RNA sequence: CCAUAUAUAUAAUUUUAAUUAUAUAUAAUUUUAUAUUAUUUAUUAAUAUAAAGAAAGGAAUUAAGACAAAUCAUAAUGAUCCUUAUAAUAUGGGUAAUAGACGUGCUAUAAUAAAAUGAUAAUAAAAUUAUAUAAAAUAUAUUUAAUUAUAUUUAAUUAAUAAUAUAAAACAUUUUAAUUUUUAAUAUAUUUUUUUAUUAUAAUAUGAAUUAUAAUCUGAAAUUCGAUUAUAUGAAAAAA
């Protein structure tokens, strides 16, 4: 097997969260708020 | 070879190699030691010998060696025939007697008890001489079975 | 012998059987004749130093008839020349553990004794920081006084110093203390000391009630600060214990640990050190010495400029106030160097003459080999390790 | 002033001993996203460091505690042979050998 | 390959004991010693460790003729002291090969094989 | 240590804003460690092998 | 022998240790708090206490929830669980 | 074949541990010389003394008989039995119950021994980190700080790089019941961190089971039945 690190010198210049919103905007949770 | 180093080698031709350790003191400290705490055993022994020196003002190591040689029995009856003892076995017997005598004293520190016991032995005051005499007397009584 | 080994060798009078030797006597006036020689202290020096507590346990003093000292060019002579020459005489003796900081301090004490100076020695300041003697809040002095320790210290100041010298100082104020002398405690309730009639000796002999004893201490120090006819040497051994114990073991009525500077003794010590208390003589000096038994932290090296100030170091390991006080008074360090091989030769020679060396070393070993071996084993010149390699290495 | 503000705001990502600011990102599924994210963070850091109109943080010293804790975990062999112990007089000296010189001809 | 002193007159040797290793620079001198840049009594608190370190120099009666710059790592105090002892002996052979036999007789040129074995 | 806590709070807030970190000076439990926890469902589910094997 | 609330103490006993040893509700920190309140220094021993100080300790301990009262509270917790 | 010692190669000596790493090769199953003992008479063996050596350990590797083994969980085959149930699923419960008896381990029963403290940080090895690891900091317990335990926030590293993790005993100081062998008041001293005089002055400051209260941790869930912390409690355990 092989691992390669590349060093490139350069000039200077969420699944849970998207479900928590869906649950909170559900009737089961929206009714308590 | 260079001449300076040839001279060094000639000078060391006659000199005996110094001893790594004192075998008798090594034996005694290893008999004090438990749990591989050698430094503690060496501290106890050296502190006791320091007290011996300070109270007798003589080489305490020599006093300890004279004490062990005199106190230890030369032979001992075993199951009943007398058998001779080597130096290490003699030192073990004598040291056990010395420690038993020292643990009858008052100081909390074992070094103080041992040191003043060794001072008393160095001045010819010890009950273990009676133990040595009894062992020798039994050996004489059973000399016929050697 | 019922104590442990250290207390036995400190208190069992084991030197009763030490062979006398006629050493030359310590005399900084005649330093040239005693330089690089083992000397004894004078009789006067011995009395004063014993009362001061210049000698300490675990110094192997019991090996010899009396405590002795090698007069060292690089430690004794150098330090004392600085002590006589420097304009601001405020020193911290430093160096590795067992190097000879306390012995150098005692040589300074002996110099003071023979120089007609008054010595106030706070040896081992753990007595007033460990919470093992009483304390009480004084309302006039906004500080926690410690009457038991003050009684002991005032007796030490009286006993150590030359009575005629200490009587030379006339009091500069009037003082009134509670009378606690048993004979006239009832007939006379207050002892009174007048200006130009009673002396500092009279004040220093006052018997007062414990709650008032703190004021007596102030009365003493103030007096010695105002007089200009006698130099005052103020010495503190194991000063490191003060720098690394900013909060004592005492706790106030609210159960909070008391700051060391809220104690009268802490305030007194750091006032003398910081220069807040000024001694008018001009030959007066302060000599501090660290000890290897105390923990090290950033306070000391920062106060000496050895390392920069790192302001994020926790208070346990860096006390800025002590740095501020030690820098306000221009306290300079004197590092005790380790012994060189010639000094080792002189010390081991004296030890031989005292019949202290083991037979394995003197009887059958070449002298130069012995000196080289013990210079090596002492870590190239540590005096304590030298002694322990001579008298306490039975192996 | 801006360099100091940069280091103060970098906090543990800055190592004063090496002068290296380093940050890593693997929160996005692809390396190109993580690289662009790191570039954008750097831009915000530089913009804030150069904006000294409100606070330059000159009163805040540089905290090196993370670096001290890091250094305690690596053995430090910070010692060199004493300069005054050296004995160049004792070094071996090349001895003349005729054959080699006559062979370099 | 015959060992010799380097450009600074130093004999460099390596010794091992248990999991400890030591690299010593021995130069002619006056019996000075540093271990990991620290004074001998600072680094080695046990006297017997210092005696172990000194023993090879004492064998050839050359304590006081050599400066030792020892550097250790691994294992504990005893292992490090005895790896320094071994390294010093090996380094000392270079200064005078005729003494090797005597050092070999002292036991300081023999690498101690013993190690922790479950 | 002598640095006022307001200065360090300002530093912490500004740094957290720069690096997209939750700044929670009150120390309230936010459940943020729940959000940041990785999904281990795939590795756990592939334990017995790929079911779509040729039979 | 000094007596506090009908408890005897050898003279050499350290107050902060002795109080925590002999009184039911008192522990190490509580005993140290009492000693701090009464101005006793950390390692003061029983034989050094004056009778006024003994009475002050007695009053301070009586204002505490200790001995029979605390034991009754504990037994009441156990009994209420048993119910 | 490991290990050990050495040589070569490799590393742009910042993935640093070059005192290292791991490939290849070498080495020993050591050898020589005398002296004394014996000898199947030396060209033998042992002991001792010399000489050269770094040289001193370990593992694996074949068959044949005998007996045991169905958590034989070291299988396979066969036989036999159940097939609405001896198969299968869910919820809760149990495997943790307590009179005894015994095996093993841990913590103890104190002074050759326990405790506390020790920041330019005494001194390791071998492992682990993509189904993680958790640095520093901050906050609370909590008391100037430190220590310890949680919380907040997740820096770096998926690793000779960063983290788990400043190894701990050691060593030094201080303390320690039994112990009037102590503390304290006065004097006292050329022992001053101390001496002396006169006065007063069987379970602990060992042990940490059990129990109470309040918190915390993991988990959807800690009741039967988990772990941790704080304040209390403070049992048995001494002799042979
Ligand atoms: N100049 C000297 N002459 C003779 N003996 C000395 C000298 N200096 C030190 N010693 C002895 O060496 C040992 C060192 O003790 P000392 O009290 O002087 O050390 P220290 O540096 O003050 O120690 P610590 O770090 O413990 O405070 C003691 O035996 C002391 O007697
Ligand atoms: Mg000192
Ligand atoms: Mg306990």
Nearest partner of C297 among C246, C332, C259, C339, judged by Cα: C246
Contacts 24+ apart (CB under 8 A), E49-53: E49/E77, E49/E78, E49/E80, E49/E81, E50/C376, E50/C377, E50/C379, E50/E81, E51/C377, E51/C393, E51/C395, E52/E78, E52/E81, E52/E82, E52/E84, E52/E85, E53/E81, E53/E84, E53/E85, E53/E88
Q: Residue C40 forms beta bridges with which residues?
A: C25, C68
- DSSP helix/strand/coil, C235: strand
Of ligand 1's atoms, which has the minimum distance to the CA of residue C347?
Answer: 4
Q: Which residue places its CA closest to the C1' of nucleotide H111?
A: B108
Q: Residue C232 forms beta bridges with which residues?
A: C118
Assign 3-state DSSP to chain F and report helix, strand, coil percentages, each to 5. 45, 0, 55
Ligand nearest to the CA of G28: 3
Query: What CA–CA distance (Å, rounded) separates C208 from C151?
Result: 9
| Contacts of residue C59, Cβ cutoff 8 Å, sequence gap at least 6 | C67, C102, C103
Name the D residues in 22-51 with CB < 8 Å from any A CB.
42-43, 46
Neighbour-count burial of G13, counting CB atoms closer than 10 A to its CB (0-12 exposed, 13-18 middle, 19+ buried): middle
Q: Which residues of C78-94 are buried (b: 16+ CB within 10 A; e: fewer)?
A: ebbeebeeeeebbbbbb
Phi, psi of C122, deg, nearest 5: -95, 85
Q: Which residue places its CA closest to the C1' of nucleotide H173?
A: C293
Residues of G in contact with C136 (CB under 8 A): 39
Residue-by-residue DSSP string for C336-384: PPPPPHHHHHHHHHHHHHTT-S-HHHHSSS-HHHHHHHHHHHTTTT-HH
Assign 3-state DSSP to chain A and report helix, strand, coil percentages, each to 5. 40, 0, 60
Query: What CA–CA distance (Å, rounded) separates C173 from C151?
Result: 22
Chains near E (3 or more Cβ pairs under 8 Å): B, C, D
| Contacts of residue E102, Cβ cutoff 8 Å, sequence gap at least 6 | B12, B17, E59, E60
Q: Which residues of C25-39 are buried (b: 16+ CB within 10 A; e: fewer)?
A: ebbbeebeebebbbb
Of ligand 1's atoms, which has the minimum distance to the CA of residue C290?
Answer: 27
Ligand nearest to the CA of G27: 3
| Residue D90 to residue E5, Cβ atoms within 8 A | yes
DSSP state of D55: -
Please report, to the nearest 10 degrees, the dihedral formed by the alpha carbons of residues C170, C172, C174, C176 taken in order. Answer: -70
Contact D13, D23 (CB under 8 A): yes
* Number of domains forming the structure of chain G: 1
How many residues in chain D? 105
Gap from D59 CA to chain F (nearest CA, Å): 8
Chains near D (3 or more Cβ pairs under 8 Å): A, C, E, F
DSSP state of A21: H
| Residue A17 to residue F39, Cβ atoms within 8 A | no
Distance of C142 CA from H107 C1′ (whole Å): 51
Nearest CA, atom 9, ligand 1: C100
Summary count for chain C: helices (H), strands (E): 17, 13
Could you tell me whether strands E66-73 and E33-35 are parallel, antiparallel, or unpaired per DSSP bridges? Answer: parallel
Residue-by-residue DSSP string for C379-392: TTT-HHHHHHHHHS
Distance of F27 CA from H228 C1′ (whole Å): 21
Contact E67, E90 (CB under 8 A): no
Q: Which of strand H's nucleotides are less than 7 A from any protein C-beta?
A: 3-8, 14, 16-20, 51-57, 111-113, 117-125, 130-132, 134-139, 143-146, 151-159, 161-174, 176, 178-195, 200-201, 204-205, 211-213, 217, 231-234
Sign of the dihedral defined by the CA atoms of residues B31, B36, B42, B44, in that order: negative
| Contacts of residue B45, Cβ cutoff 8 Å, sequence gap at least 6 | B25, B28, B29, B32, B114, C394
Nearest CA, atom 7, ligand 1: C100
Q: Does E42 touch chain D (CB under 8 A)?
A: no
Greatest pairwise CA separation for chain B in angstroms: 68
- Domain hosting residue G15, numbered range: 2-82
- Count other C-beta atoms under 10 Å from residue F37's C-beta: 9
Residues of C in contact with D64 (CB under 8 A): 310, 312
Query: What CA–CA distance (Å, rounded) separates C214 from C149?
Result: 10
Contact C190, C114 (CB under 8 A): no
Nearest partner of G22 among G38, G43, G1, G7, judged by Cα: G7
Query: What CA–CA distance (Å, rounded) separates C61 from C363?
Result: 24
Q: In this structure, what CATH number is given to the domain that contains residue G38? A: 1.10.8.50
Q: Which residues of G36-47 are buried (b: 16+ CB within 10 A; e: fewer)?
A: bbbbbbbbbbbe
Gap from A3 CA to chain D (nearest CA, Å): 15
Could you tell me whether strands E11-17 and E20-28 are parallel, antiparallel, or unpaired per DSSP bridges? Answer: antiparallel
Query: What CA–CA distance (Å, rounded) separates C367 from C373?
Result: 10
Gap from D102 CA to chain C (nearest CA, Å): 50
Residue-by-residue DSSP string for C189-221: SEEEE-TTTSBHHHHHT----HHHHHHHHHHHH
Q: Which of G36, G41, G44 sits opposite C253 (nearest CB)?
A: G36
Tally D–E CB contacts below 8 A. 46
Neighbour-count burial of D69, counting CB atoms closer than 10 A to its CB (0-12 exposed, 13-18 middle, 19+ buried): exposed
Contact C178, C208 (CB under 8 A): yes
Q: Does G3 touch chain C (CB under 8 A)?
A: no
Phi, psi of D38, deg, nearest 5: -65, -40
| Residue F11 to residue D57, Cβ atoms within 8 A | yes
| Contacts of residue C63, Cβ cutoff 8 Å, sequence gap at least 6 | B54, C15, C18, C354, C356, C387, C391
Neighbour-count burial of B48, counting CB atoms closer than 10 A to its CB (0-12 exposed, 13-18 middle, 19+ buried): buried
| Residue A15 to residue F39, Cβ atoms within 8 A | yes
Question: How far, in Å, from the CA of G79 to the mean position of ligand 2?
Answer: 62
Q: Is C381 in the pocket of ligand 1 (CB under 6 A)?
A: no
Query: What CA–CA distance (Å, rounded) separates C308 from C318?
Result: 12
Please report, to the nearest 10 degrees, the dihedral formed by the alpha carbons of residues C262, C265, C268, C274 taken in order. Answer: -80
Residue-by-residue DSSP string for chain E: ------TTS-EEEEEEETTEEEEEEEEESSS-EEETTEEHHHH--SHHHHHHHHHHHHHTT-TTSEEEEEEEESS-HHHHHHHHHHHHHHHHHHH-GGGHHHHHHHTSSS--------
* Cα–Cα separations (whole angstroms), residue C323 to C236, C243, F44: 17, 9, 60
Q: Does F5 touch chain C (CB under 8 A)?
A: no
């Amino acid at each position: 097997g092989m691992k390669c690190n590349f060093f490139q010198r350069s000039e200077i210049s969420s699944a849970v969260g998207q479900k928590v919103l869906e649950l909170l905007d559900s009737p089961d949770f929206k009714k308590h708020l | 070879p260079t001449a300076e180093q040839l001279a060094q080698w000639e000078a060391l031709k006659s000199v005996p190699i110094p001893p790594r350790k004192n075998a008798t003191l090594d034996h005694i400290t290893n008999m004090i030691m438990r749990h591989g705490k050698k430094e503690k055993a060496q501290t106890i022994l050296s502190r006791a010998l320091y007290l011996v020196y300070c109270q007798t003002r003589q080489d305490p190591i020599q006093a300890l060696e004279k004490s062990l040689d005199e106190l230890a029995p030369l032979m001992m009856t075993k199951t009943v025939i007398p058998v001779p003892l080597n130096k290490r076995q003699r030192n073990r017997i004598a040291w056990n007697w010395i420690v038993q005598s020292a643990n009858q004293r008052v100081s909390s520190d074992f070094a103080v008890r041992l040191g003043e016991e060794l001072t008393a032995i160095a001045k010819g005051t010890s009950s273990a001489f009676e133990k040595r005499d009894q062992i020798h007397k039994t050996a004489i009584a059973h000399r016929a079975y050697i | 012998l019922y104590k442990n080994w250290t207390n036995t060798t400190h208190t069992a009078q084991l030197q009763q059987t030490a062979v006398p030797l006629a050493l030359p006597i310590f005399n900084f006036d005649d330093i040239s004749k005693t330089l690089n020689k083992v000397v004894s202290y004078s009789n006067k020096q011995y009395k004063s130093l014993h009362h001061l507590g210049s000698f300490k346990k675990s110094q192997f003093n019991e090996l010899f008839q009396k405590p002795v000292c090698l007069v060292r060019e690089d430690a004794t002579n150098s330090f004392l020349k600085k002590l006589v020459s420097h304009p601001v005489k405020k020193f911290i003796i430093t160096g590795e553990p067992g190097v000879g900081k306390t012995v150098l301090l005692s040589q300074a004490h002996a110099y003071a004794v023979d120089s007609k100076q008054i010595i106030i020695n706070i040896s081992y300041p753990e007595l007033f920081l460990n919470g093992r003697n009483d304390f009480s809040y004084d309302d006039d002095l906004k500080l926690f006084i410690q009457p038991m320790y003050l009684k002991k210290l005032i007796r030490k100041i009286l006993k150590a110093n030359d009575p005629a010298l200490l009587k030379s100082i006339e009091l500069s104020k009037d003082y009134k203390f509670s009378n606690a002398n048993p004979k006239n405690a009832s007939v006379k309730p207050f002892v009174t000391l007048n200006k130009t009639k009673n002396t500092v000796l009279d004040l220093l002999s006052v018997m007062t009630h414990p709650h008032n004893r703190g004021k007596l201490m102030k009365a003493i120090i103030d007096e010695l600060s105002v007089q200009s006819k006698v130099p005052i040497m103020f010495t503190v051994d194991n000063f490191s214990k003060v720098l690394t114990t900013a909060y004592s073991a005492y706790r106030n009525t609210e159960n909070k640990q008391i700051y060391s500077l809220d104690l009268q003794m802490g305030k007194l010590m750091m006032d003398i050190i910081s220069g807040e208390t000024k001694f008018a003589n001009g030959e007066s000096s302060t000599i501090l010495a660290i000890s290897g038994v105390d923990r090290t932290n950033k306070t000391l090296p920062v106060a000496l400029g050895k390392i920069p100030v790192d302001p994020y170091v926790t208070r346990y390991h860096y006390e800025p106030k002590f740095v501020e006080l030690l820098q306000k008074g221009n306290v300079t360090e004197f590092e005790v160097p380790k012994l060189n091989k010639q000094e080792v030769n002189e010390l081991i020679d004296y030890y031989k003459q005292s019949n202290v060396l083991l037979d394995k070393d003197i009887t059958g070993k070449k002298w130069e080999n012995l000196i080289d071996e013990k210079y090596f084993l002492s870590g190239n010149g540590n005096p304590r390790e030298l002694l322990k390699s001579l008298v306490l290495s039975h192996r | 002033k801006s360099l100091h503000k940069f280091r103060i705001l970098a906090r543990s990502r800055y190592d004063h001993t090496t002068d290296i600011f380093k940050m890593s990102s693997d929160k996005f599924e692809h390396a190109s996203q993580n690289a662009r994210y790191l570039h954008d963070i750097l831009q915000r850091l530089l913009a804030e460091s150069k904006d000294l109109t409100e606070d330059d943080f000159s009163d805040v010293p540089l905290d090196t505690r993370h670096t001290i804790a890091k250094s305690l975990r690596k053995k430090k062999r910070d010692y060199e042979f004493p300069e005054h112990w050296k004995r160049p007089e004792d070094a071996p000296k090349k001895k003349f050998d005729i054959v080699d010189q006559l062979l370099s001809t | 390959k015959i060992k010799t002193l380097d450009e600074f007159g130093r004999s460099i040797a390596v010794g091992k004991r248990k999991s400890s290793t030591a690299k010593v620079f021995v130069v002619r001198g006056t019996g000075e010693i540093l271990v990991n840049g620290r004074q001998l009594n600072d680094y080695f608190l046990k006297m017997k460790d210092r005696e172990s370190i000194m023993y090879p120099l004492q064998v050839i009666e050359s304590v006081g003729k050599y400066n030792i710059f020892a550097t250790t790592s691994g294992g504990g105090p005893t292992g490090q002291a005895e790896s320094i002892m071994h390294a010093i002996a090996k380094a000392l052979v270079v200064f005078n090969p005729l003494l090797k036999s005597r050092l070999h007789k002292a036991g300081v040129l023999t690498r101690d094989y013993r190690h922790v074995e479950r | 240590m002598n640095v006022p806590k307001a200065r360090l709070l300002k530093v912490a807030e500004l740094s957290a804003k720069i690096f997209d970190q939750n700044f929670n000076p009150s120390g309230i439990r936010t459940g943020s460690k729940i959000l940041n926890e990785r999904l281990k469902g795939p590795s756990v589910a592939s334990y017995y092998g790929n079911p779509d094997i040729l039979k | 022998v000094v007596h506090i609330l009908g408890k005897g103490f050898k003279g050499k006993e350290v107050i902060k240790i002795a109080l925590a040893s002999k009184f039911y509700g008192i522990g190490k920190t509580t005993a140290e708090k009492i000693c701090s309140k009464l101005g006793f220094y950390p390692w003061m021993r029983m034989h050094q206490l004056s009778e006024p100080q003994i009475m002050s300790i007695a009053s301070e301990l009586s204002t505490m929830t200790i001995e029979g009262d605390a034991r009754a509270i504990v037994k009441d917790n156990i009994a209420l669980k048993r119910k």
